[PDB]
Design a protein around this ligand. Sequence first.
Ligand SMILES: [Zn+2]
Ligand SMILES: [Zn+2]
Lengths: 273, 271
Amino acid sequence: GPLLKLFDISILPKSGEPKLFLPVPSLPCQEAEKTNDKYVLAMAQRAMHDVPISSKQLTANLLPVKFKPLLSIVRYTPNYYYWVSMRKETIASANLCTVAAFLDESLCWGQQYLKNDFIFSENGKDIILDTSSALLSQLVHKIKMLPFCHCLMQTTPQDHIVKQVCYLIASNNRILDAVRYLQTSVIKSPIVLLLAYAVCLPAAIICTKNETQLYSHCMRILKEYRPGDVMNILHESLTQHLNKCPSSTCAYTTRAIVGTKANTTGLFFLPTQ
Amino acid sequence: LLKLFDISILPKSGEPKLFLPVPSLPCQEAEKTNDKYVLAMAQRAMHDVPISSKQLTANLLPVKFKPLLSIVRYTPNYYYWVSMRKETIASANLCTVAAFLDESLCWGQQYLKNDFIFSENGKDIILDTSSALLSQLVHKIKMLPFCHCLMQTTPQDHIVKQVCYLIASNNRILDAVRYLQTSVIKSPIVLLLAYAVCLPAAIICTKNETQLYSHCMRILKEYRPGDVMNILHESLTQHLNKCPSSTCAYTTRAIVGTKANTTGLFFLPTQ
Ligand SMILES: [Zn+2]
Ligand SMILES: [Zn+2]
């Protein structure tokens, strides 16, 4: 029919000088952390900066003796919103290298909770666990950006599972529905396994007593994880893909998604075997 | 009780992995231009330099357009440039998204001014990243605390939600244009989405979708250079001064970021 007005002109700001920056709230000063442990303080100092990820490597069988010391910051920091905001900034702008590093860190950390019989619950504050939902969303976003030969050229692609889990998370952050969907099938694709690993902690933290069965499935996934699995799975899958994919352009699209290197701002450690 | 996973999908334990593999780039070829300004612009484009140093006023872009085409449209290094830009966009905070959006819209306006056609085949390193940019803008909007959409004079919250759903769920670009053209735009967030959709939608319109194409052209023609940065700056400034939530400030900082990554950005157009 007739052409309609596009938009209310009052939406536009008053003319002025070019805007070259976006404003961000000024950050209140941080309090001193509540520990005198110089190893823990050193680890926090290094988490604040984008250190080369090889420097942040931590052998996972040494993590149990570091867990309770590091809790003095990870659980008990008086700077909770500062730390979570720093980690969310890195995750929200993360390439797949960065996503993978953060996922291995968060799963190894969650296994320490399991080893010490700590419960998972969104009430108690934990700067690592409380960014696991943002990390799941970022992983789904990276998977959706990959050329779809990455999922189709697996031995058992299970592409309908990849698509539906990604849909559930990307459309409406339907985390528990993604767990319900994943538990109806044996996992046979490494991409599906990455999704299962990424969903297990964000789901466990929001389960209530009525979702005890889903919680038990998340605990099964967490127990089967082994330190370094996320990086190991991606390293293998990406190498195999370069050795078999006939597309002229897939490698250029993939390199952009994977990125040149990880950003470790807010990352305390990269756990490895 | 169902087995959890086939153990054969797990890789052989070997070396600790401290990086993810990507192949090395070949040597790039010389760009097809001797124009000193354009070659200087390309050298700056390769680095993450302060964005104040890529500023380009609206009176200067029209004359530099045809010179810049020698790279943007006719480079022998198309995959180098596009993959560099897609890498920045795929890891972008909102500062970076905003800069690249203004760049793409001003570039698209120069296409219109010169009666060029929009299509997927025409190789253009700026327009061929506009769909990635739209997806990234939607991703940022969805992470913002919702006080950002609700605290507008006319939030149109249902429009923001549906457009974000269409793009994030299945990249339904033309359906998003169809939905947007049913209503007058009254929220700055909806206007940003409309600006971000118009070039990706124009590029994939066929002969059966000339009415949608025409709507994209109205949006592109009404855009004013710098609008994306100006709108976001005003809106973020008002929200800081009026939102009472402490959690919102910290979350907003994380999404917005503290500076842009200009790697692959050729220019930041302004008034
Ligand atoms: Zn491929
Ligand atoms: Zn707010």
